[PDB]
Structure formats: C-alpha cells, structure tokens
Design a binder for this molecule. Structure first.
Ligand SMILES: CC(/C=C/C(C)=C/[C@@H]1Cc2nc(cs2)CC[C@@H](N)CC(=O)O[C@@H](C)C/C(C)=C/C=C\C(=O)O1)=C\CN(C)C
Ligand SMILES: Nc1ncnc2c1ncn2[C@@H]1O[C@H](COP(=O)(O)OP(=O)(O)NP(=O)(O)O)[C@@H](O)[C@H]1O
Ligand SMILES: [Mg+2]
Length: 378
RNA sequence: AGAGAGAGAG
C-alpha cells in the first residue's frame, strides 16, 4: 500500500525526471495509496481532501501504462469543465516532458479543423477533454477507442450527476469491456456510489467520511448581512482585503455575475467576470490574466468551483451559498492549495443562516465570525 | 426530476 517516495514506485527513469522537474519531492497522502493500484490495472475510486494532488495521481498512473512505442490513444480523461480540462492537460505533459508522450486536449470552443487535423495526423497517447467534444470526435471516428484501456473521471460525482450521466454513458458505450475505470473527486455521495456498481468490477474503494473532508489549512468564516441588498457594500468594504492576494467570488447564476461586476466597475473596483455564456476566447483570456497575477479578484460561477488550481489564490468569498451540499467543499478548496493557508468567507443573510447550519452539522465543522486581524491570515 | 451550474459541431 504505502510508498515512501516516487523512486519506490518502479517508474521509468525518464518519468521520475519530469516529476521532480515539475516541483514534487514527496508523494501526498492519496498519491502514496492510489498511484500503484491505478498502474496495476484495477478499477479505482479515489477520494481525498481538496488540493492533495489528485490530478497528478492518475497523470502519473496513466503515463506508466502508456506503451509509448504504440502511437495510439490509450487513456481518456474527462472533466466537467473546459478550464479544468486544459489545466489537467498541462499537468500530464509536465510530468511526462522527458518521455515524448503526447497528450491532447479535446474540449469545446477550440478550433475544430485544427483538432481534426492533429488527430488524423498523430494519435495522442492521452486524451483529456470534456464529454461534448470527446463524444463528438468519437462519433466522427476521429478518436478511436480500439486501444483505450484506461478511462478516468475527474470530479466523478459531477460527471455522474443528472446532467452528465447520460453523456458519460454515451462515451462508455463506445469503450471496450476490459477498459479500466478510475474515479476521482473530493466528494462522493452515497447515491453516486450506488451507480458505480452498474459499471465497475468491484473497484478499490478509497473513501472518506464527510466529517473529515474540511481541510485544516482552510479557515472558514461568515459575515452577517441580514438582507441581500447589503451584500454589495460588504464586498466593497472587503475589497482592499481581497487584493491582498487573489480571491474568487462565487455567484450562483451567470446573470448575477454580470450584475455584480457592472456594479463594482461603476464604483471603480478592478474585478473580472467569468461564466459559461462567455465566448471561449474570453474565458481563456480571463483565466490567463488570473493565473499570471494580472487580475487579482475574479467573480465567477460554479464553473471554477471544481478542480481549478491557482496557488496564488488564498481567499474564497461565497457571495451566494451553494445550492448543492457537496459543491461547498470544492468552492473553498480553491484557496490554501496543498498545505498552504487559505481563508473562506460566507456572506450569509438571515434566511441563509438556516442553510449554514446544515453545512456545519453535515461536515462537523464550526464556522466562526470573521475578526479584524484576518488580513494577516490571508 | 427540473431549475441553477456545466457540458459537441454549426
Ligand atoms: C456548451 C453548450 C452545449 C454543449 C452540449 C450540448 C454538449 C453535448 C454533450 C453530450 N450529450 C450527450 C452526449 S455528449 C447525450 C446526447 C447525445 N445522444 C447527442 C447526440 O449524439 O446527437 C448527435 C446527433 C450529435 C452529436 C454527435 C453530439 C455530440 C456531443 C454532444 O451532444 O455534446 C452550450 C453553451 N450554451 C451557452 C449555449
Ligand atoms: N507530490 C506533491 N508534492 C507537493 N505538491 C504537490 C504534489 N503533487 C501535487 N502537488 C500540488 O498540489 C496541488 C494539488 O492540486 P490537484 O492535483 O488539483 O489536487 P486536487 O485534489 O485534484 N484539487 P481538487 O480537484 O479540488 O480536489 C497542486 O498545486 C499540485 O501542483
Ligand atoms: Mg482535481
């Protein structure tokens, strides 16, 4: 089970070079437990706290099984969002820089002809895309499941929810029977575990209790607002505290993201907006300016709630509370990346305080009011 | 379930 370091995993001398070149030194908790089962060909259900290195878990696992001499698609990874797919693609190529393993992003909003040309020319060893463009190319027979022996679902609970389930099944129907299935997500509701019995041959169940998901490095607070109409002013009074680093402001609707943005712009406050109705060129720019520190504050929807990794981010503001119990975990997970110190602030009204109790009792975590010395905790 | 949030091409 346990492994001391990457060297003790029987990885190629060229793979261990790309791992340490990326910045790693010692495998995280889950990495020591799941990287070997995944390479051994077992169906794995890996659950771990946020920011613990689940992306590199399967990325290392995939890169080991890839018979680089075979120039065909051998692994398929699916993400609920495009931004996450692009992020996952870079992590794979990074860990396999000295290997020559080709990893292609098969996401929406990209140039179709360019992708069709790249696939017909060369077959990437690893596909990391979203269900839409992935199932499209499979239908056009530009992607071949013939040699796909590994099928990974990041944020599995979201990928197996009401909206994505039928999409995953349309893709799964085109895969072989012997295809290995790997599931990863910080959350794994019981209802989602009931459907894994439908398409997984008794996998390795690495699960975690809900009372232990709350990270210790993420401090959770709340602010009494009473009425919705005062949330704006409260956010502005926090502005100079937000710009202390990089902050993510979560809003439950696209329409409200644009409303708040135009309201803060009208007050001479630098904030960026991000949601799914924007053109893919806008989303790529906005996300670029955010990672490069150009923009410090970002007002977004649940699009960026899951998996988005920005180490510079150390503050998460919940302008609205999530309508999904599990989504709260992923939201706060954007700060305090891998042991770092992170802060989460929940703007709660009176009618919303009812909801906050459920979160505390569900995950067994107390969320105390914010002090004035919080600028030093960021 | 839907809504919300996401999730091909055009
Ligand atoms: C991003 C977005 C919208 C994304 C969609 C809509 C992404 C979808 C996801 C999937 N659904 C399914 C699988 S995969 C299940 C239904 C499936 N049977 C559809 C089908 O096979 O029809 C054929 C005929 C056409 C075809 C091969 C489609 C391939 C992919 C596809 O349908 O993409 C909208 C943005 N808003 C702002 C407008
Ligand atoms: N062995 C390692 N040592 C140190 N840092 C690491 C290691 N592996 C990964 N990381 C970093 O830790 C962070 C974790 O990111 P990620 O792999 O996305 O975890 P995650 O669990 O998938 N996040 P989430 O989707 O919200 O659960 C990233 O900044 C990685 O670069
Ligand atoms: Mg992740």
């Amino acid at each position: 089970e346990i492994v001391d370091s990457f060297d003790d995993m029987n990885l190629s001398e060229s793979l261990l070079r790309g791992i340490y070149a990326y910045g790693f030194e010692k495998p995280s908790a889950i990495q020591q437990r799941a990287i070997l089962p995944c390479i051994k060909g077992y169906d794995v259900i890996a659950q771990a706290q946020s920011g613990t290195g689940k992306t590199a878990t399967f990325a290392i696992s995939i890169l080991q099984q890839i018979e680089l001499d075979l120039k065909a698609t051998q692994a398929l990874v699916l993400a609920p969002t495009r931004e996450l797919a692009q992020q996952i693609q870079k992590v794979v190529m990074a860990l396999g820089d000295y290997m020559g393993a080709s990893c292609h992003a098969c996401i929406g909003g990209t140039n179709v002809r360019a992708e069709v040309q790249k696939l017909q020319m060369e077959a990437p060893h690893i596909i990391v895309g979203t269900p839409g463009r992935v199932f499209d190319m499979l239908n056009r027979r530009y992607l071949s499941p013939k040699y796909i022996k590994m099928f990974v679902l990041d944020e599995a609970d979201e990928m197996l929810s009401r909206g994505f389930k039928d999409q995953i099944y349309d893709i799964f129907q085109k895969l072989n029977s012997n295809t290995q299935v790997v599931l990863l997500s910080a959350t794994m509701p019981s209802d989602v575990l009931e459907v894994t019995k439908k398409f997984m041959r008794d996998p390795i169940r690495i699960l975690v209790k809900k009372e232990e998901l709350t990270l210790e490095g993420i401090r959770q607070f709340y602010i009494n607002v009473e009425r919705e109409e005062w949330k704006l002013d409260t956010l502005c009074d926090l502005y100079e505290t937000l710009t202390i680093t990089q902050a993510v402001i979560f809003i439950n609707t696209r329409r409200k993201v644009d409303w708040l943005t135009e309201k803060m712009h009208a007050r001479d406050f630098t904030v960026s907006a991000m949601h799914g109705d924007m053109d893919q060129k806008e989303r790529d720019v906005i996300m670029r300016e955010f990672r490069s520190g150009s923009s410090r504050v970002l007002i977004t929807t649940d699009l960026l709630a899951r998996g988005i990794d920005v180490q510079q981010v150390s503050l998460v503001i919940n302008y609205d509370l999530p309508t999904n119990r599990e989504n709260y975990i992923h939201r706060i997970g954007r700060g305090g990346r891998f042991g770092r110190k992170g802060v989460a602030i929940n703007m709660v009204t009176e009618e919303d305080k009812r909801t906050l109790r459920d979160i505390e009792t569900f995950y067994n975590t107390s969320i105390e009011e914010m002090p004035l010395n919080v600028a030093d905790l960021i």
